[PDB]
Design an enzyme around this catalytic site. Sequence first.
Site: not given
Lengths: 276, 487, 23, 46, 458, 467, 260, 25
Positions: F154, F180-181
């Site tokens: 993604k 997210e990260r």
Amino acid sequence: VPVGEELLGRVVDALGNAIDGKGPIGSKARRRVGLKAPGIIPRISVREPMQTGIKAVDSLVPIGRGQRELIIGDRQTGKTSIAIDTIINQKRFNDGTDEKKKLYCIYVAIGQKRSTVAQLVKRLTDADAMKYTIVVSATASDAAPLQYLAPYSGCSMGEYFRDNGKHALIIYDDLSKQAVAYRQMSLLLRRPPGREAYPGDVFYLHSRLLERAAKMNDAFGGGSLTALPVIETQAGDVSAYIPTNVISITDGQIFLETELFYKGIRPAINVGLSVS
Amino acid sequence: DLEETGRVLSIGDGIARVHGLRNVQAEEMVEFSSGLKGMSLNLEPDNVGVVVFGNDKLIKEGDIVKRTGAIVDVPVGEELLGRVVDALGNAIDGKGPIGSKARRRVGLKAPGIIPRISVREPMQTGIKAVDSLVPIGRGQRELIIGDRQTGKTSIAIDTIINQKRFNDGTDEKKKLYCIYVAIGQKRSTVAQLVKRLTDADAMKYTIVVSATASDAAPLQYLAPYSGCSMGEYFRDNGKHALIIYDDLSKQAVAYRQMSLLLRRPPGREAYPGDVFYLHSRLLERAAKMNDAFGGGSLTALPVIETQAGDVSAYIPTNVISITDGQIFLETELFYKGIRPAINVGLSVSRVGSAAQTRAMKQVAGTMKLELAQYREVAAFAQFGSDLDAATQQLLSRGVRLTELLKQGQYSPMAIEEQVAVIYAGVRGYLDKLEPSKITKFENAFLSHVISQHQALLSKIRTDGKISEESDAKLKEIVTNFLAGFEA
Amino acid sequence: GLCGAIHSSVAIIGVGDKIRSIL
Amino acid sequence: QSARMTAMDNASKNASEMIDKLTLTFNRTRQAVITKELIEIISGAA
Amino acid sequence: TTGRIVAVIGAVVDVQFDEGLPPILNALEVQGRETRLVLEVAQHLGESTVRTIAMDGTEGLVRGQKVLDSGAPIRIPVGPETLGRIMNVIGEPIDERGPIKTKQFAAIHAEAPEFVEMSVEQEILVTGIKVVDLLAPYAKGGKIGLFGGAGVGKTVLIMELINNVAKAHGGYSVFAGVGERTREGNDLYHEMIESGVINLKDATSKVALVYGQMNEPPGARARVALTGLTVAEYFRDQEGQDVLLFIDNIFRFTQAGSEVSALLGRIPSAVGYQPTLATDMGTMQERITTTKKGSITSVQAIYVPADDLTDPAPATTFAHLDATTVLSRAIAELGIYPAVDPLDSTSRIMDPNIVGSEHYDVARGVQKILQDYKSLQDILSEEDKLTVSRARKIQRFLSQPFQVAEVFTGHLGKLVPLKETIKGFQQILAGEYDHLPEQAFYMVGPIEEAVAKADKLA
Amino acid sequence: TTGRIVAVIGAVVDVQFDEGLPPILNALEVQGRETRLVLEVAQHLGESTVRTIAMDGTEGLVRGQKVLDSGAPIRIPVGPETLGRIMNVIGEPIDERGPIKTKQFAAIHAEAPEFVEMSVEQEILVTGIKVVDLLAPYAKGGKIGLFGGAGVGKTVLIMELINNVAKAHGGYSVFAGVGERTREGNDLYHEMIESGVINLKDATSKVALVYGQMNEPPGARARVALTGLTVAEYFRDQEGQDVLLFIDNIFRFTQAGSEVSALLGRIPSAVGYQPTLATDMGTMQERITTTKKGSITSVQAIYVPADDLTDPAPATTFAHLDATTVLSRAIAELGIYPAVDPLDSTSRIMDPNIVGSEHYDVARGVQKILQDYKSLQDIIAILGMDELSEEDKLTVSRARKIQRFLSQPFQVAEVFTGHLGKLVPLKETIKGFQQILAGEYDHLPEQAFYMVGPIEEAVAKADKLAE
Amino acid sequence: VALVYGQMNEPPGARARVALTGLTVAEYFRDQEGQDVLLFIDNIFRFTQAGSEVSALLGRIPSAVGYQPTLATDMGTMQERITTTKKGSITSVQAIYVPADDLTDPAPATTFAHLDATTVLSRAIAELGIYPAVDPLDSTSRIMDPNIVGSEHYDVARGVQKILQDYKSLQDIIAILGMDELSEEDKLTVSRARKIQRFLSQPFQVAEVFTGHLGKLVPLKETIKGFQQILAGEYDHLPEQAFYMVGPIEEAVAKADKLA
Amino acid sequence: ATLKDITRRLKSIKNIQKITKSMKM
């Protein structure tokens, strides 16, 4: 928790108390267990090799310093053995005098039996690897809060090296058992269960822990903490809820399978399903 | 006063708990001090559970709630034709007020056993596979069912577009007013939809009722019923209406939100025990009336979205059981080139032949039998190089008729055009034509007969069948046309 | 193939495409 | 030709028994999924 | 006594009573409403309050609205005057013909016959239909699962059954539409009028209709089978009849029970069904039986959810079934009517002990020869050729013209006595008619007509 | 008005007000904190008590602690001064570059544009990505979704799209990091400085950044998407120029809602989700849109839990999109990147009247051959290739070449592939698949088609594979 | 021998605690006598099941599959006492019931990590007539290590497991088409694997009524040698049934001689 | 293992059953 180089070569419990019969742990520094991960700015891209000494890992799914790389698979597929070979691998660098190439190791045992942890320690001592390794152990008969806590406490010990221009490696063996201990606590606090009876924020439990593994820019010392969390699957289903939760946190995964293991593919790494 | 007014005790997630209102009726619409409306779904000893028609940011603890004698009704009549309205009949197309002369309750009971008569008038979709193998009659409820992006809305839109030929005509029995209900869709999707209907000149006989994704759950819950009452106006005045509920899966999701938040007991997939009842009340209102009650009709085409082909999930099961038949759409047919992606073997119409004209009835029977015989042998169509001629012929007739059931979008066909193509495959005139060329053949063939042999197509319409004279003329045209096309 | 132990039992010419692909 | 006739007869029989076995596994799993989902919903509500 | 509504939550209504509370199952009448609203007591909640399930919509209800305890469960008209009429779950006429003028009324909740009332006599209920009587016979007091969707001649079979049981035995029928589609309820009614099983001009009607339509609340659809049962119980327990009861659909009886259980806050069991699945089914089914007075035999159309025969609903229902009638599209497309699959349809009373030794042998012979014919379809010798032509003539002699399909076709419909059926298939198995043509056996009644069809067409 | 904390359980904080009770959605300020701690009002529980969701950690909170009503929802900086900067949920700078030099603010909660404001314009947006352009092309101003399970691609795809579309964009872009990260946030930030799309010294920055990653408590993760899109709404409405909005990952908005749902006193819906999943999503998604006032091309990464596309979160997302790119682990596992499922990716503009008959015919031809092969695979795995007719084994070999020619080396994936990245014009994409379908490369080996750009590279690779 | 009993006629409190009673007796012999103890428990699952019954009565919010939320900690506090120490040896053997044959059930699934050696039985294997019904690809030991058992032992074990796994992942094709469709190479691996499967079966002294054969006990060196010879193809010519229900490899030879 | 996986296998072995029967014939 107690924090610093005095913990090296020692086996401690979830609060850093000496459980190895070698005497009290005397560090000059302490550190909180529940600190938030560094944000965007204190960081810099992972660029330094964290060598496992395992051909398949280092060539196909390479790990850098500051990275999180999951080790995942069914029971008895070789998960711990990846982490152990990795710790033993660092002796080559640690015997030298270049501090930026050294890697200090932390093994966190969660929910294991004491005799297994003891055999683990005997192995690391025989390979002369314990001298640069901290063992943090919250075992099967330790209360659920201690098992829940152990990964964070080990993480704090590793963040000491990270924030002081040194490099540490931390293994969480395993996060499946930590999630189980946390599920118990949560159900008994009467917090209503979600998927598979795990608490609604079982993702957040692991994501806050694993985000703390990071590579620091030169302003913050240039140090790092590398994490190898371990997840046990059931019947080899990498696509399950908790596995994909943790896969969705880490910077890759090493997937091990029984089929490959018995075919003679050892280490039993599935190449297509593993990533870095 | 605590009889005709109340005070909000708590508010959250579209649910207001109200003290007082001792005289409120079950399902009554009440008003908040902010102007927002609510419906009294839970009457409990110490509170009223009120479901909110909007954002709850404008409702606070201690806010006054009033009975207003409000009746839950919508505008109704020919003035809605060409208009796009919300769940309550308010214009959302920006074209000013609805000039409605009449109104009707959204919550009404369906006609009973007696006021009805057997479904017998065709409701033509203009889609060959449907009109021939899954025929729909006026007053029927025919489910359109399949996974995401299987072609469900397209069947409904093409059916609406198809009515233009009747609505432009002079026959005072064939016309058909259309109502498209959008539930839980995004606004831009509905905007694209209305553009399509506008360009096709279909809006002039169509009402669009829309309760989109950002509309509060009770509005999405009501929209189908609101649309139904609009169709019932035509039904009760000797006219014929078609309603599409796109889709009832999303309506059920909205109702589930309300039920759960009202703390009603959850069941399978967390739906309440009255979720069947929700859809059965709605769909039973589609009816064909006897001459004594005006002879009008309301036909319903509910839409259900399945997940990974599970037609046995809770909501699909309910609506399958309620309806008179189902058009099953499938992903692997869609990508195989079967478009529309109808599973002919599984799809059914319990009204069946009663809803077909003689022209269609003279060819649909033969086609149904030959495809059934083909389906028994089809698995080894590619694994039978040495099997006997009899089963080779079943396979050869087989994927020829299947190719003839394929159809493009936005050009629904007149019944005489349908039977002229179905006859050509049935009477065996394409058995020697390469499978892959049939779709492109029909396009060319149909353009040719429409332009040059309108006299022939009229003969199949005026006489209501294919005569020997028509059969001879169609033989000459098809056979000679086939040889030119395959070069 | 798909005839059990016909080819395997009988297995430089060989008549049959299975004969040469196996040998 | 006899051996192929024989082997294919047996294969078609083995396929039949496997269809039955798989259909039974399918339906046990089908029921278990529904039951498990419901037990999670009930536990959350209680 | 008069109570007061204290809660309304969908089709669930709580009522407080000042004095003695109405027992569970009692019908309560809501005061001051246009049509009739019955509430059935389900629970005593404590503090003088009962929880009830509504039999119609609850919109417009106000807390404090007066509610009257009737003193009994729902009571409905029972007697000869129900025949030809349509009533709802609470016994109201819904055919617009006026009151159903019976001289008796009866409670819809009635205990199943006691152990001492049981008949050990196993008896065939002769339907006069060749496929059914020979191969999968109905048992008096038994339950028959009717399988197949639509387009397989379900309603015509039903109407002929009603016609035949009344003609042969002299017993009436009751049709309970459980979750009836209103459109199909109208169709069935007018089809019955056309066939003559319902007569609007005199008292010769053979069926009483009871409809619980799909748009009615869970409570109504759950209880309507009981209403139909109660109408049937009159003809058995008061008139000594062998009665037929049709339940269309048994799954919708289960489904409505699941919905009611859900509404009352009872925790769902496996697959989302009510925890009372088996007792809900049992208390109803056990009322269908042979007693000293007579018998109620029931034909029950079966829907199998997800085509899973191990699903709790069909599994629980199957425990109560004694026979099956499988209506097949394959049999229909072959032109054989009734479209009953002669191999898939089975009966527990197909036994040399219950039915005659002559009955069992011939039926086993018909089964064997139809299975052997299917075996020889894949592939003949003189013995194999003899078994093929015999079986093809058996396939046709299983077909039958119906009395109910006489005005539609013009072909004279036939009711074939039991012994005429047995000896008909007996004379074909023996090869006594392998001297005569094949298609002379298609669409006839007694074998004497198949001989005459060969005598005329030679 | 002033309240007191009465309860704390994780991210959920109850506050009692003796007087002026704050309305739902209001932002409350906890007193006695070193760093600003915002609570958002979620419910009125009764008894003068509101239930709130915290925007930061709740450690250190005490029952009795004072809380101020700000008198408004969370308000954040908007306008051109957000460009080149990084902001958090509540609008604070997290880039160590001092204050956001602005004084125009906007509430993160807003009504969705009405039906009358909708645009029906839909023209192709070429990506240079073969599989996307051929089978399910994106539209300018349309809603694009990138579905995928954990680790299927993604983010790599969204980064490639930013590289192929945003670097040469005529307007502004907003990237919203949602759950997210943090490492990915740092990667992207320094990459855009290196490319010049962010400039730390002049005002030529083209992209505004908003982040609340998986290190944050659920309140933050539940609201960062609203913050990110608020920035986008300003650029759309007050300007009228075209905007690109990238979100990674929008699932995290729904996940955060599910994390706090039980503590907000909700009975669970199916699969442990909040009963409000669909309306929550609807009120957020319906703001992410092009209007008659301005265009937003939105690209949202969508996580698929346990790889199950029927999971309520992704399942509910499909209806909000105009183009869907569905990624599959089953495909990634084969080394086919990008791991796009050609039989589960769709687009509104995949229509012969929009893309032309040539484009449409080749796309449907590719899908047909692949569906035919998919249906055969399992039969041939048991009965063998030799049992196939010549027509069937021709469709097998061509299908396998087509599967491979859909794979492509991405510029942003050079660290993973070992191959130089490639961008393929739409013209070349159509031609290439046309020729394979037509049997023009039946003589070439399978592997020649794997991991290349244009069809000329497959020919060249086939020559190289000889010797 | 000391005996402690709390069987399936007992209410759950007794069934939940009786394992602790047994342990306590063993703990004394281990510690206050410093002696080698053997502890046999049939059946330890019943401890966890009993816990599930009480947990339901204690009103806890249930965990997965209806189990007590304390399943793992309860098991840990009990299992960690079943152990050898520096003070004395306990060789413990615990029979472990598997609900509905589901090894992923929380009870058996949580038990694995408490063990040094696992013998996993299979119903499918029992139904084929192989007793003891051990799954040779799902039974493990910490001492299965070349540095512990020697390279010869280790190599033969892994060699046996490789051939069995190779046979296993052909089951799909074999179930449909039979063994006759396979390549000569795969047919060889199937024939040897089937002989190995049979040579892994063994008559038990205790099961003589059921097998009909005198019980056999095989020396380790003879076990290694027998499977070594099969893997080497030394008995490729012998019929499969010769290897069924014997002791040492010589009995399989003698059995084949009587057949042909 | 999982319903989707069994669904594909079931369609596969159903096709094989038919083909094997025709091949026998």
